[PDB]
Design a protein around this nucleic acid. Structure first.
Length: 95
DNA sequence: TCTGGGTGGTGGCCGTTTTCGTTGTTTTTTTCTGTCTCGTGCCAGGAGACTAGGGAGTAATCCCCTTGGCGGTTAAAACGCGGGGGACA
């Protein structure tokens, strides 16, 4: 029985974070997983293009941030950048 | 006293409002069923700790080209007049 990976459990955790008393259906979970994969691919591809354009061989958090600012619209981009910076700072704080 | 004009009342026609029944749809309570969510167990991917190397950060130098400004020419933009053909009712 093949072991197929998905974002189902993390999407569920985020859902219980925002709407504690609310479930999700299998079809909706599949749509959410597809959405996460699509956004991942878009941001990662834009970051790869950014690194290539600058003759840089590494994808850093700066490349991800610029990719996010390019892809997402105004307010969504602002808040995504805020969350990303928060997470990166919290990560570097701990070891 | 008669005729014309204007106002007031009555009647007729038209428009609006309501007024009503009829379907269609929404809401509510009961049923029941199958997928969502939780648990168990295993495993394999992530973590930890460590070494090696070079990608990239950083400083210094330089040489391009981006900015600024200035004057002369004149091509283009503006403003106006006029008319007719196109929008639209």
């Amino acid at each position: 029985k093949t072991r197929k990976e998905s974002y189902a459990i993390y999407v569920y955790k985020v859902l219980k974070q925002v709407h504690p008393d609310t479930g999700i259906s299998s079809k909706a979970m599949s749509i959410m997983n597809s959405f996460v994969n699509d956004v991942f691919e878009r941001i990662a591809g834009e970051a790869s293009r950014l690194a290539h354009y600058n003759k840089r061989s590494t994808i850093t958090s700066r490349e991800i941030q610029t990719a996010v600012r390019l892809l997402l619209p105004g307010e969504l981009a602002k808040h995504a950048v805020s969350e990303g910076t928060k997470a990166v700072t919290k990560y570097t704080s701990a070891k």
